[PDB]
Each structure stands twice: as structure tokens, then as C-alpha cells.
Design an enzyme around this catalytic site. Structure first.
Site, PDB file in Angstrom:
ATOM      1  N   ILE A 171      -5.888  -1.479  10.090  1.00 61.70           N
ATOM      2  CA  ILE A 171      -7.247  -1.827   9.691  1.00 61.70           C
ATOM      3  C   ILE A 171      -7.594  -1.145   8.341  1.00 61.70           C
ATOM      4  CG2 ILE A 171      -7.989  -2.464  12.055  1.00 61.70           C
ATOM      5  CD1 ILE A 171      -9.416   0.426  12.024  1.00 61.70           C
ATOM      6  N   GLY A 172      -6.579  -0.555   7.713  1.00 55.51           N
ATOM      7  CA  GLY A 172      -6.730   0.148   6.449  1.00 55.51           C
ATOM      8  C   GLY A 172      -5.437   0.612   5.831  1.00 55.51           C
ATOM      9  N   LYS A 173      -5.371   0.608   4.516  1.00 60.04           N
ATOM     10  CA  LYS A 173      -4.189   1.099   3.810  1.00 60.04           C
ATOM     11  C   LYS A 173      -4.571   1.737   2.465  1.00 60.04           C
ATOM     12  N   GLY A 174      -4.291   3.031   2.335  1.00 60.69           N
ATOM     13  CA  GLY A 174      -4.509   3.793   1.118  1.00 60.69           C
ATOM     14  C   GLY A 174      -3.180   4.091   0.453  1.00 60.69           C
ATOM     15  N   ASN A 175      -3.197   4.914  -0.623  1.00 59.86           N
ATOM     16  CA  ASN A 175      -2.002   5.309  -1.398  1.00 59.86           C
ATOM     17  C   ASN A 175      -1.338   6.630  -0.870  1.00 59.86           C
ATOM     18  N   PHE A 176      -1.362   6.807   0.472  1.00 66.39           N
ATOM     19  CA  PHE A 176      -0.811   7.966   1.188  1.00 66.39           C
ATOM     20  C   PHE A 176      -0.970   7.788   2.704  1.00 66.39           C
TER      21      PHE A 176
ATOM     22  N   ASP B  44     -17.007  11.369  -2.541  1.00 62.28           N
ATOM     23  CA  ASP B  44     -16.557   9.965  -2.608  1.00 62.28           C
ATOM     24  C   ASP B  44     -17.532   9.021  -1.872  1.00 62.28           C
ATOM     25  OD1 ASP B  44     -14.881   7.884  -3.675  1.00 62.28           O
ATOM     26  OD2 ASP B  44     -13.495   7.970  -1.949  1.00 62.28           O
TER      27      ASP B  44
ATOM     28  N   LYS C 271      -2.737   5.314   6.189  1.00 66.03           N
ATOM     29  CA  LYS C 271      -3.047   4.014   6.765  1.00 66.03           C
ATOM     30  C   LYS C 271      -3.884   4.228   8.027  1.00 66.03           C
TER      31      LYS C 271
END
Ligand SMILES: CCc1sc(C(=O)N[C@@H]2[C@H](N)CCCC2(F)F)cc1-c1cnn2cc(C(F)(F)F)cnc12
EC number: 2.7.11.1
Length: 304
Positions: A12-17, A128, A19
């Protein structure tokens, strides 16, 4: 498709480090979201930021901040079991349903202010705050997510664009003014194609205001979008504002205080024994804010 007491469903999500995956707590049947992190792919500083993140998460208890339940540790991977904000991003909600009417923006914004203030009180600065990190449960309540970068340019204060002084709470306050601006208009107050244009407009601090906006709304934004962090109003002060409280005559927005949590619900204690939990195990690991299989199960048996 399984870690601890959880069945991993869909990403349900994916970042640059990291998930995020939606998961089901196999005992209680409750849905949760697990932030999965491969520690081997992280550099020494982001590894330090991940450890800061886990500490910050441990020390927060607000009904409008995604709450941590369990930490599943492995040599190579870290598993952060938290609440699942069912209704998704506010960002999406705005594109999907259009700008919010001021009663709606007020209902949501009071929560954000309560949650962001609480963090500043417990000496935390989100750093953020973006409509992406703002989410909703099925009852449409705000749940501030992430905390990865705590202690985006269209939300970033003028001082940060220059590379000036630190301080902290004041940079989250400028962001709240950007959030409220989007909540009520749909669009961002400061934009512009390449980074040079966006930097110029944030620094000049000039924003158009739409005809439909109330005079009290245009005023309250001026208290947040102050170009000088020193002259920028405080959250204790803005909580007292006319706008924040329209239609909340009795209950004026006052700072949040974490209530006395009952770690002795006789009904949830016995129901746990019928799963495989023992009196001594429950009592020892509940009384202490451990965040283990036990703690998670007890908090999830009063959620539905
Ligand atoms: C584990 C609980 C976390 S941690 C957290 C998080 O850190 N995200 C960051 C980043 N902002 C986005 C990329 C992945 C990332 F790097 F991890 C978000 C959530 C979360 C909780 N409910 N929920 C529902 C949805 C949605 F919209 F419904 F799909 C999406 N995310 C969540």
C-alpha cells in the site's frame, strides 16, 4: 505472506528505502499497516534516522497520529506494525472530492493542530508535513503518518529554502498554513514549474486568495504564512483564533493531554488466555510499554 502474528496482504506504499503493506493480525482479525525496512540497503545516516524514527514513534499517543503497535526485529529487516488509515491520503481526497468546505477543513485542521502541537510539546518536530502524510480512517479522522524525517519544497518554510538556521516547531507551523491553504482551495499557495520559481514565490511569500474564502480564513493563514519565523504565531496562540473554533462554542481547541490508559480490561485479559496467553505473561508485558505480541493483541482487542 506471514511475519509474526500477521498475514501480509498488499503493498500500500513504496518509498526509496521502505515499503508499507496492509496486513491482517491473525488472532484478532484486525487490519493493520506494516512499514517494512531492509536495514542492509540503508547508509549510516538513514540507519541513524530509522532508529530515531522508531524511538519517536514509541513516545507518541494521540488519536490523530498513526500509532505503533509492535516492532518485529530481524538481523536484516525491521517491521513496524501500526494503524491502517483506511480512507487514504487527504491529497487524493481533495482531487477526488474537490476543495473542502470550511466546516470540513476546520474539523480536519483542529485535529492536525492538536497532533502537531502535542509533538512539539513532547519535543518532536515532524519536518515533513505534506497532504501525502495526512490520512484518514473510515470515520474520516486525520492520522499523521511517517516520522522518518523528524527530530518537501511546496510545504517548506522560507528559512529552509535559503539553508538558514534550525530552531524547529516554527517550520512545522509554516507547513500547517500550506496544508490549510490546500484544504480550502484544493491547490498549493506557492508553486511554479522548475525549483527556481517555487523558491522565489516561497521567499517573496505572496499567495493569491480565492473569492469564496471567508475573511476569517484569509486572516488565520496570515498568522501561519509569516515570512519571519520569529514573528510567526505559536500553536498555543492560533488554537485560540476565531476561525479554529467557529461552530465549537463550548469546546475551544485546547492542548491535548494523553489520558490514563487502562492496562487492566478484565474482558480483554480473559479473551487473550483463550488464545494461548498466560496470566503472568500478560501482566508483566502489559504494565510495561514493551510493544510486543502481547501489547499489540490487547490494544487490537479494543479497536474492531
Ligand atoms: C505502517 C503505517 C504507515 S507508515 C507510513 C509511511 O511511513 N509511509 C512512507 C511514505 N509517506 C510513502 C511511501 C512509503 C513510506 F516510505 F513508508 C504510512 C503508513 C500508513 C498507515 N495506513 N496507511 C494507509 C495507506 C493508504 F493510503 F490507504 F494506502 C498508506 N499508508 C498508510
Amino acid at each position: 505472506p506471514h511475519v509474526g502474528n500477521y498475514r501480509l496482504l498488499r503493498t500500500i506504499g513504496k518509498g526509496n528505502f521502505a515499503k508499507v503493506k496492509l496486513a491482517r493480525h491473525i488472532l484478532t482479525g484486525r487490519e493493520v499497516a506494516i512499514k517494512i525496512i531492509d536495514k542492509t540497503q540503508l547508509n549510516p545516516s538513514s540507519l541513524q534516522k530509522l532508529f530515531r524514527e522508531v524511538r519517536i514513534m514509541k513516545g507518541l499517543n494521540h488519536p490523530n497520529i498513526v500509532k505503533l503497535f509492535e516492532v518485529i526485529e530481524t538481523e536484516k529487516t525491521l517491521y513496524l506494525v501500526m494503524e491502517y488509515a483506511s480512507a487514504g491520503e487527504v491529497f487524493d481526497y481533495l482531487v477526488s472530492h474537490g476543495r473542502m468546505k470550511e466546516k470540513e477543513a476546520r474539523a480536519k485542521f483542529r485535529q492536525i493542530v492538536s497532533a502537531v502541537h502535542y509533538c512539539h510539546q513532547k519535543n518532536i518536530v515532524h519536518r515533513d508535513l505534506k497532504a501525502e502524510n495526512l490520512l484518514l480512517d473510515a470515520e474520516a479522522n486525520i492520522k499523521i503518518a511517517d516520522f522518518g524525517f523528524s527530530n518537501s519544497p511546496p510545504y517548506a518554510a522560507p528559512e529552509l529554502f535559503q539553508g538558514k538556521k534550525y530552531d524547529g516547531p516554527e517550520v512545522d507551523i509554516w507547513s500547517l498554513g500550506v496544508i490549510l491553504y490546500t484544504l480550502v482551495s484544493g491547490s498549493l499557495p506557492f508553486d511554479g514549474h522548475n525549483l527556481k520559481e517555487l523558491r522565489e514565490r516561497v521567499l517573496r511569500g505572496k499567495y493569491r486568495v480565492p473569492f469564496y474564502m471567508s475573511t476569517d480564513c484569509e486572516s488565520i493563514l496570515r498568522r501561519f504564512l509569516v515570512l519571519n519565523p520569529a514573528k510567526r504565531c505559536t500553536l498555543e496562540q492560533i488554537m485560540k483564533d476565531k476561525w479554529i473554533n467557529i461552530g465549537y462554542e463550548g469546546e475551544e481547541l485546547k492542548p491535548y493531554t494523553e489520558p490514563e490508559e487502562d492496562f487492566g480490561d478484565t474482558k480483554r485479559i480473559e479473551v487473550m488466555v483463550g488464545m494461548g496467553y498466560t496470566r503472568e505473561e500478560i501482566k508483566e508485558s502489559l504494565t510495561s510499554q514493551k510493544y510486543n505480541e502481547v501489547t499489540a493483541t490487547y490494544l487490537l482487542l479494543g479497536r474492531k
